[PDB]
Amino acid sequence: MKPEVEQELAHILLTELLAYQFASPVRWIETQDVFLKDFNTERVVEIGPSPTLAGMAQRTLKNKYESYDAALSLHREILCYSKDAKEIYYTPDPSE
């Protein structure tokens, strides 16, 4: 597949994914499992005015990732842009 065609197709794909998204359900359960299990994300950063997707991550972790995170010695960090600026920008306060 040529780059030009890959783009032309990626376009049509993106277009349709957003078009139907409008009037289909939002599969945030599976989405969370993709980035939590399949990608083993150690830093989930919510870009938003309030930590509502962060709140959801913490809960999905507490439910079905208790033993998984333990066994894989997998420290995880849920951050929201509005709540935890200092952690995201790596600027801890004058405490050393």
């Binding site: 208790e66 033993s67 998984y68 995170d69 333990a70 066994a71 894989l72 010695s73 420290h75």
Partner: protein, 331 residues
Amino acid sequence: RTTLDAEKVFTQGLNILEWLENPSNTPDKDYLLSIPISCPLIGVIQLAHYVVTAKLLGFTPGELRSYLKGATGHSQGLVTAVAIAETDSWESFFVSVRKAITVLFFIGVRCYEAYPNTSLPPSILEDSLENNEGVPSPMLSISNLTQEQVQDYVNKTNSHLPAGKQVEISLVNGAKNLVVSGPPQSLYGLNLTLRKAKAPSGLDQSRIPFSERKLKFSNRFLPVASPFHSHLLVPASDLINKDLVKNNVSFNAKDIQIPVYDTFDGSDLRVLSGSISERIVDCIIRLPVKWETTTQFKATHILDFGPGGASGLGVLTHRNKDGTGVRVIVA
């Protein structure tokens, strides 16, 4: 000198006479604790305690071992147990000494080569330390849980890990005293599952009904460099036995003058129809220790020649047998 790639393991030599003379010339505790040097040298400590014990009683080694109903060892103590059984006069002592410490040497060298201990991610170390667990190592001790209880927690922890990183129950020292071996990182993942189920050790549930209280138990890592009695060491068994063949070491039932109790069975190693050397290796490298059933003999007195005085195998055995008329002496 004799053994092919031996020096590649003994990175800071093994000039033990220099270490004892000039403390300032002793390697760091990490080097000393790694099995290629600690295995043989523990054997030397036990053999030495056996000697002072004999010499002060005015006995020869054989005279001492004649007074024994039997003998056995925990983990790599099994080696110096069978070596003691063959013992006789002083003139023929150093042949038994040779036999023991050349077994322990190859166990060390081959079991290190099989699973050498690598850099521990500092994050994991800092965490285990601040939670009063140990310095992560390949063997993890667990007070106050049933064998079948511990086995649940390993099954769960193991369910998410591939073959190479699985952990298994290594030792069954008592009813509610177990040890688990595997990669230090895998045993950390166990400790994490464990930290959740355990209650703070000063919780005070004195006003909660017994039935509804939460489990209180210890789990600290052990000071050992290698995961004894685990699948990680299996590859070494074959090679170790070939090294004993090549260095003219084996143990013929005919020579061993007291029963020497098998670490997994409780059986006598004399009754075996295989090679004894091979079973002793297999008992240390791969098979668990069922210390309770190993120690199933009847006797009024037990002598712990083994390292660690009051932290030693002696006192553990005493706690198992308290109230049955057995006296343990830390030799």
